[PDB]
Structures are given as C-alpha cells and as structure tokens.
Design a protein around this ligand. Sequence first.
Ligand SMILES: *SC[C@H](NC(=O)CC[C@H](N)C(=O)O)C(=O)NCC(=O)O
Ligand SMILES: [Cl-]
Length: 218
Amino acid sequence: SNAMKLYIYDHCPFCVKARMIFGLKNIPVELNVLQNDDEATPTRMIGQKMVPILQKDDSRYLPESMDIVHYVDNLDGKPLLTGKRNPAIEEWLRKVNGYVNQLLLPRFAKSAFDEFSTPAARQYFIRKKEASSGSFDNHLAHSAGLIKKIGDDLRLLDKLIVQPNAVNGELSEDDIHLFPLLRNLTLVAGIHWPTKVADYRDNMAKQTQINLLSSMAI
Ligand SMILES: *SC[C@H](NC(=O)CC[C@H](N)C(=O)O)C(=O)NCC(=O)O
Ligand SMILES: [Cl-]
C-alpha cells in the first residue's frame, strides 16, 4: 500500500519524467492534474508554482523531476536505473530541445490536456509562452520545415537507440530524459519516425503506463 500523489500538467515533460518510474516498477500513484493557471495549489505545497510535485507517504512534498525519479526508484531498495549514460544522447537532446518547442507549444495550446480545460487556463498558457518564445502562428506556419528538421534528427537517434526498453542497453537517466520528448512529439502530425525510434517510443509508453498522443495529433 502507498498514499503517493503526483501533481502535474499532462503536457509537461518533467511531469512525464516523474511518472515513468511508477509505471516501470508498477508502483501505484494517484495523478492529479492541476489547472495551468492555478498558482495557489502548488504554492500551498512547496511555496511556488511548479510541477511535478510528489506527495510522499508521510504527507510531505517533494518537487524536482529527477529528485522524484530517484526517490521513487530507490524506495524499495532495488533501483531500475542501473545503466551508463551516453554523452551523444545528452548532446542530441540538448540540440533538439533547443528548437522543438516551436512545434510543441502551439500544439499543446490547441489540444485537450486537462490543465487547459478552462478557457482561462488555456489563455494563461498562450499568453505566457507567446511573451517568451514568440508567435504560435508564426511557428505553426513553419511546421513543414520544423517537421523535416525533427525527421532528420530522428534518423541519427535511430542509430543510437540500443533496444526498445533502454536507449543505452540498460535503463538509465537517458531514458528518463528521452521518452518525454518522444511522447510529446507524437502530438505533431507529419513526422517521419524511424523504426528503432518508433519501437522504443511504443514500448516505453507501454512499460511506463504513459499514453502517446497520436490520437489527437495535429
Ligand atoms: S513543464 C511545467 C513547468 N515545470 C518545470 O519546468 C519543472 C522543472 C523542474 N526543474 C523539474 O521538475 O525538473 C512549470 O511548473 N512551470 C511553471 C508554471 O507556472 O507553469
Ligand atoms: Cl525535458
């Protein structure tokens, strides 16, 4: 038995990270999606508006995706995170995460994630992102080129994925960082997915108990 709760936004890759170990280890967790404009709830918990937040069995709260990942992986004394990391994956992720939000943010803002269920929450998101990283319409109008870019980058990634259940052969923090990106990329209609990338994406979604977004791709 456990009483763990995880406060999230469904679109947030850090929140996906925090959910992964629960799925991989079959540890129950109660997901609670917060409205994107809700400052008060997370502030009561941790003193700031940030997700993910884990509520531990003792009722105390733990923020920071990777701290949650390691706490939960370590709680039973037998971690699954046993593998080496590949500097090439860190580099690839840095490069892709540098431009990918031009595809993702405009699509998140148009999609049925629970954190955007109210018009106010959706507007809050749009306003904040557009005031920081530019026009959603401009980015959407550049989709063809951006889609070709991610397709090209995915072809290299394909050659680096060792197997569908571990990017480097044994599960590592590279899986924790890679899967959320691939999972959010399934919201982007038009991408050419290489075989090994698709197999890893599909298997990891199954093993982590985290849905892909293909059914609402746009
Ligand atoms: S994706 C939503 C945002 N979360 C984070 O960026 C978490 C980063 C932490 N360092 C981590 O958990 O690793 C977020 O909560 N945005 C603030 C907001 O007002 O939406
Ligand atoms: Cl990320």
